[PDB]
């Protein structure tokens, strides 16, 4: 289930921004 | 039927006139910002409440009044040596401009020889990221009166020359109320047409971000259908774990809902989130009436919403001044204020 990737994924702490 | 026209005609004309005289009082601010308005001395300092890459906010005592509030600190030498000047001034003259009352509340900014220093209003609640995480997803009705103060944000921003360009839920503070206030207005803007710095978080950059274009507030609500999304489904419509392959989605033209999404909330969002500049809600000659009068949004009261007279679906709980049960804990680090002036005059404005 695309829950289960998302929580299996390195994507689901704080999300840094980009600037450059 | 006609009182339905009829009350959304005379609140259209009052939204106008508000937001006329909301452009009066914010150039005024705008032009002429307040400075030095504290002292770090005042202020006990009692918690990190979050970092960020040139600093941090805490929870700190005004020590003269004994309130609480947010107080974000951040290095001078950090940001000059990250060339990042611009962005920092933006934020701080952007705060002591703007009044609403889904926004972060400045209530007085100063710098020392080492830092700069903006002191806001505690939001006892915490970051929404923090509850949706927990939780897993919001309900329709949650989602929704979240997106309903973010909608009204954003047309009050947009109506200043505002870019906002970081839209998410570890941006969106939750006071006692329920209700959200915006923070991290780093990498806000006030432009008049177009832009082009590469800023903001991977999941929620728009297309037209990624692919070099120049562009507009039009991001903005872009960036709305993605954070209505992850709220709704408990992910966002575009991950992965390298950057380039949420870019690749994005680009893509293709997005795939929950099966409990409703049909509405499916329909806003493949408006919402439309590679086509000039077939995005938020973006076409009505504006952001396109997104208040959707279907999904037809239980709203917008007016209400403005005045915080809705009852939040969910409110986190408090157990008195100064509590921060709601939030995470980081690792402490003593302020060490340098005996020598850094970087003086690239944050004379300050």
């Given at each position: 289930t695309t829950y289960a990737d998302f929580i299996a994924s390195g994507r689901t702490g704080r999300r840094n921004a980009i600037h450059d | 039927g006609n009182a339905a026209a009829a009350?959304?005609?005379?609140?259209?004309?009052?939204?106008?006139?508000?937001?006329?005289?909301?452009?009066?009082?914010?150039?005024?601010?705008?032009?002429?910002?307040?400075?030095?308005?504290?002292?770090?001395?005042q202020f006990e300092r009692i918690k990190t409440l979050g970092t960020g890459s040139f600093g941090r906010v805490m929870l700190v005592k005004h020590m003269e009044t004994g309130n609480h509030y947010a107080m974000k600190i951040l290095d001078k030498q950090k940001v000059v040596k990250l060339k990042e000047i611009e962005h920092t001034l933006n934020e701080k003259r952007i705060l002591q401009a703007v009044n609403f009352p889904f926004l972060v509340?400045?209530?007085?900014?100063?710098?020392?020889?080492?830092?700069?220093?903006?002191?806001?209003?505690?939001?006892?609640?915490?970051?929404?990221?923090?509850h949706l995480r927990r939780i897993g997803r919001f309900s329709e009705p949650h989602a929704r009166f979240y997106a309903a103060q973010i909608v009204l944000t954003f047309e009050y921003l947009h109506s200043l020359?505002?870019?906002?360009?970081?839209?998410?839920?570890?941006?969106?503070?939750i006071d006692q109320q329920g209700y959200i206030?915006?923070?991290?207005?780093?990498?806000a803007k006030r432009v008049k047409g177009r832009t082009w710095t590469l800023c903001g978080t991977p999941?929620?950059?728009?297309?037209?971000?990624?692919?070099?274009?120049?562009?507009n507030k039009a991001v903005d609500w872009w960036a709305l259908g993605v954070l209505i999304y992850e709220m709704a489904a408990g992910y966002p419509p575009f991950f992965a774990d390298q950057p380039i392959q949420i870019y690749e989605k994005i680009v893509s033209g293709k997005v795939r809902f929950p099966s409990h999404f409703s049909s509405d909330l499916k329909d806003l969002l493949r408006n919402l989130l439309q590679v086509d500049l000039t077939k995005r809600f938020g973006n076409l000659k009505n504006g952001v009436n396109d997104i208040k009068n959707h279907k999904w949004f037809a239980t709203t009261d917008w007016i209400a919403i403005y005045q915080r007279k809705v009852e939040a679906p969910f409110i986190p709980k408090f157990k008195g001044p100064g509590d921060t049960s709601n939030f995470d804990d980081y690792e402490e680090e003593?302020?060490?204020?340098?005996?020598?002036?850094?970087?003086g005059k690239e944050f004379s404005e300050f």
């Open positions: - | 009350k959304k005609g005379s609140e259209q004309e009052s939204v106008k006139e508000f937001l006329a005289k909301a452009k009066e009082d914010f150039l005024k601010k705008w032009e002429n910002p307040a400075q030095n308005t504290a002292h770090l001395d509340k400045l209530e007085f900014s100063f710098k020392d020889n080492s830092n700069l220093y903006m002191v806001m209003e505690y939001a006892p609640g915490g970051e929404m990221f923090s020359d505002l870019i906002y360009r970081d839209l998410k839920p570890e941006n969106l503070m206030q915006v923070t991290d207005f780093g990498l999941e929620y950059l728009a297309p037209e971000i990624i692919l070099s274009k120049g562009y003593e302020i060490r204020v340098s005996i020598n002036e850094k970087c």
